[PDB]
Every structure is written in C-alpha cells, then in structure tokens.
Amino acid sequence: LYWRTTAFSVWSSKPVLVRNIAITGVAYTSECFPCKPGTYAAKQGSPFCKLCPANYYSNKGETSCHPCDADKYSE
Amino acid sequence: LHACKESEYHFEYTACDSTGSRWRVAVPHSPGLCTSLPDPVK
Amino acid sequence: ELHACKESEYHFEYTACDSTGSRWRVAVPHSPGLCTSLPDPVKGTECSFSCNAGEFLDMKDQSCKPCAEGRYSLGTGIRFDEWDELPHG
Ligand SMILES: [Cu+2]
Ligand SMILES: [Cu+2]
Numbered sequence: 001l002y003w004r005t006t007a008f009s010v011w012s013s014k015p016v017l018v019r020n021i022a023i024t025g026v027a028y029t030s031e032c033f034p035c036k037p038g039t040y041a042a043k044q045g046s047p048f049c050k051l052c053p054a055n056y057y058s059n060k061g062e063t064s065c066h067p068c069d070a071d072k073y074s075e
Numbered sequence: 076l077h078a079c080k081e082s083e084y085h086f087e088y089t090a091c092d093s094t095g096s097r098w099r100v101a102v103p104h105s106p107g108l109c110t111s112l113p114d115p116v117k
Numbered sequence: 118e119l120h121a122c123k124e125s126e127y128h129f130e131y132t133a134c135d136s137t138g139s140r141w142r143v144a145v146p147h148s149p150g151l152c153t154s155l156p157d158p159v160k161g162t163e164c165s166f167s168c169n170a171g172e173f174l175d176m177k178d179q180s181c182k183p184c185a186e187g188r189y190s191l192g193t194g195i196r197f198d199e200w201d202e203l204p205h206g
Contacts, residue, residue: 032121034111034154059078060111061154066077087132089145100132100143102158114119114153115145 034061079109089115122152129176131161138164142179167193 001023005016035041039049040058052058052065057074068074083105089098100115120126132141140161146152161179168174168181170192175182184190197204 031123034121062078062110087141087143089130089132089143098130098143098145100130100141100145100158102132102141102143106160107157110157111154112157114150114155115143117149 036060040065076107076109078111079103083108084112119150120152121154122146126152127155132158134164140164142176170194 003018007013035049037059038052038057040052040062041049042063054075055068055073056065057068058065084101084103086099087102089100091097096117098115098117101112103109103112127144127146129142130145132143134140140163141158142161143158144155146155166174166179168190171184171190172181172192173184173190174180
C-alpha cells in the first residue's frame with residue numbers, strides 16, 4: 001500500500017490526516033485482546049472496544065466504565 | 076469488581092515442581108475483589 | 118500488548134500451603150510473558166485433598182475424576198511389583 005501527498009507550491013496548506021488504517025485478510029485467524037484502558041466492551045464478539053463516555057473512567061478488561069469523583073473531570 | 080491497587084493483594088508462591096521452579100502469583104487478600112492482577116513471574 | 122490466553126495457554130496450580138492450610142487455585146501461563154487477563158484466583162482445597170485409588174485431581178473443578186479407560190492411578194500410594202533390580206529408595 002502507498003500513501004503519497006505532493007503539495008503544489010502555490011505560496012499558500014493543511015496537511016492530509018489519516019487514521020484507523022484497517023487491513024483485513026492478514027494472518028488468517030487471530031486471537032482476542034483485552035480492551036485498552038479507557039475503553040469498554042459490553043457483550044461478547046465485539047470487533048472493537050467502545051470509548052468510555054466523558055466524566056467516566058475505566059481500565060483494562062472492564063465491562064463497564066466506573067463513574068468518576070465529583071472533584072475530578074475526564075475527557 | 077473494581078480493579079485493585081497495591082494494597083488488597085499479597086504475593087504468594089506456587090507449588091514447587093519436579094525441576095524446582097516456582098511462580099510468583101498475586102492473591103486477593105480476601106476472595107473475589109478485583110481483576111487485571113499483575114502477571115505471575117518466575 | 119500481550120494476548121488474552123484461551124483455555125489452552127493457562128494452567129491451574131496451587132499456591133504454597135500456609136500455616137492454617139489454605140491454598141489458592143491461581144491461574145498460571147504455561148510459559149512466562151505469553152498472556153494477560155488470567156482468571157481470578159479462587160479458594161483451593163485445604164492442603165489435604167487425597168483422591169482415592171484410581172482417581173486423579175482435576176484442576177478445573179476441584180474434585181476427583183474417575184480417570185479414563187485402560188489407565189490406572191494407584192491413588193495416594195506406590196507399588197513395587199517390579200524386582201529386576203533393587204527399586205530406588
Ligand atoms: Cu462500576
Ligand atoms: Cu501449557
């Protein structure tokens with residue numbers, strides 16, 4: 001795979017931004033992984049761990065995001 | 076079951092095998108209290 | 118970064134018996150650094166579980182299984198039926 005960007009020198013730009021590159025069909029079967037910190041999964045079979053809502057926090061392997069303290073904030 | 080910090084766990088040793096190797100496992104001070112315990116090491 | 122090992126990579130093992138006699142059925146990987154998120158430790162048997170003759174201790178559920186066909190266990194003992202040479206001990 002190639003990603004290439006050439007900018008024309010028009011004396012002016014905002015760079016191209018790329019995220020979430022997902023390539024399927026590699027290495028046949030793969031194994032399950034614990035959810036990353038700050039992410040939660042509710043039911044089995046999740047292809048991705050949903051992000052915990054703001055003002056809430058969580059850790060690895062959690063099935064739910066614990067509520068946070070009153071004197072604390074969390075993106 | 077919320078994740079446990081350094082306080083609620085003690086580190087205990089498994090049973091000695093034939094070759095003489097043990098595993099340092101981490102045990103909740105009282106049963107059923109947390110997950111994501113530190114990985115056992117030789 | 119590490120895996121979430123299935124039933125094939127984590128094995129149950131008993132901790133060292135304490136003074137009171139309590140053991141924890143901790144889950145241990147077969148080789149170090151291969152997986153995380155191991156099953157939580159649970160209470161083991163009180164350092165005196167002795168399976169009868171013809172049975173072996175199953176770690177998944179702490180009970181004496183009746184073994185398989187064509188195989189013997191000898192129970193919590195030993196036998197010295199062979200005498201070609203002097204047996205060890
Ligand atoms: Cu909670
Ligand atoms: Cu193994």
